[PDB]
């Protein structure tokens, strides 16, 4: 099943951990090594208890103190690691929508790869934290079919996996064929309804059947029929339906692909999935890119930031 790389540390003592952290920042200097080896070895819920003990003992906010002592990517990784799990995805979405400029790669990445259950959780958290409706904020900063597809997904009303109705699979496959390849132009609405509301098990069957009747994989047709933000979203949805860990592994790969590194994306995926399916993401990363995620990271990052990442990911050998 699904498996992360971070678990609750046994023999957990919040007060003790708070003191270790406190001693690592007191006086001039900062013992980063001590901080990273500790926080990456504690589950997210435990980090929250440490933060609570820290404030109780010293009357200081652990996160703000680290924001003062830490710098750069390492600081960003530590701050994201301290964000409550139930609020992280909402946090990211909020930052991708705030100020002039909307970060579409973020909206697409999260809303496409998160399950209906997760999306429901994210919407509640977002509203309680920012006193604003997530859907309304998305609509306000986006437009066209891209916006429409995101809204469909945000409803979290995807059909439930039940017995497969063969005739419905043929109907849907043929409907997609007719809405794209056999149509002068494209019927985006058809693509949105089907890909956004049908059950996961149903769609996996539709993808195979579509391949059989058209000679094309649904991804190829999408690339041939659509463009812009809509194309990226549709591909994210399809890839997620097939395998969320694969889609995420691919997102990671392209983050460390070529000159430089998309650090924000790199941190987001590793942190948000660390306690869910990061282990699976590794297996999908190896099987599809001839290398282990560990090596990719180990050879694209530097310093403490690099050390923290490797400890969270693990898998040195894969
Ligand atoms: Ca200090
Ligand atoms: Ca904006
Ligand atoms: Ca067409
Ligand atoms: Ca295209
Ligand atoms: Ca790189």
Swiss-Prot record:
Residues found modified as N-acetylalanine: 1
Residue numbers bearing the N6-acetyllysine modification: 67, 73, 76, 94, 98
GO cellular component, one term: cell projection
Glycyl lysine isopeptide (Lys-Gly) (interchain with G-Cter in SUMO2) cross-link, chain position(s): 26
UniProt record, GO biological process: blood coagulation; cellular response to gonadotropin-releasing hormone; cellular response to lead ion; negative regulation of blood coagulation; negative regulation of prolactin secretion; positive regulation of apoptotic process; regulation of flagellated sperm motility; response to calcium ion
Sites of Phosphoserine modification: 34
Domain notes for this protein: A pair of annexin repeats may form one binding site for calcium and phospholipid.
Name recorded for this polypeptide: Annexin A5
Organism (species): Rattus norvegicus (Rat)
């Amino acid at each position: 099943a699904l498996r992360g790389t971070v678990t609750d540390f046994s023999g957990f003592d919040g007060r003790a951990d708070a003191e270790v952290l406190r001693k690592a920042m007191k006086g001039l200097g900062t013992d980063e090594d001590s901080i990273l080896n500790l926080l990456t070895a504690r589950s997210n819920a435990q980090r929250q208890q440490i933060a609570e003990e820290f404030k109780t003992l010293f009357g200081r906010d652990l996160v703000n103190d680290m924001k003062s002592e830490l710098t750069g990517k390492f600081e960003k990784l530590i701050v994201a690691l301290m964000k409550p799990s139930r609020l992280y995805d909402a946090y990211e979405l909020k930052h991708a929508l705030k100020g002039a400029g909307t970060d579409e790669k973020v909206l697409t990445e999260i809303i496409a790869s998160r399950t209906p259950e997760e999306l429901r959780a994210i919407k509640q958290a977002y509203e309680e934290e920012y006193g604003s409706n997530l859907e309304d904020d998305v609509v306000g900063d986006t437009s066209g079919y891209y916006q429409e597809m995101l809204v469909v997904l945000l409803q979290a009303n995807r059909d439930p996996d039940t017995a497969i109705d063969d005739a419905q699979v043929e109907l849907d496959a043929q409907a997609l064929f007719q809405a794209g390849e056999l149509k002068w132009g494209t019927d985006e609405e058809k693509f949105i309804t089907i890909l956004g509301t049908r059950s996961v098990s149903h769609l996996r069957r539709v993808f195979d059947k579509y391949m059989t009747i058209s000679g094309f994989q649904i991804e190829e047709t999408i690339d041939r029929e659509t463009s812009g933000n809509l194309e990226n979203l549709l591909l994210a949805v399809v890839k997620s339906i097939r395998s969320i860990p694969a889609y995420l592994a691919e997102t990671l790969y392209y983050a460390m692909k070529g000159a430089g590194t998309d650090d924000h994306t790199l941190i987001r995926v590793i942190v948000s999935r660390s306690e869910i399916d990061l282990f699976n993401i590794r297996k999908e990363f190896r099987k599809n890119f001839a290398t282990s995620l560990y090596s990719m990271i180990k050879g694209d990052t530097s310093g403490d930031y690099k050390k923290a990442l490797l400890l969270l990911c693990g898998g040195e050998d894969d």
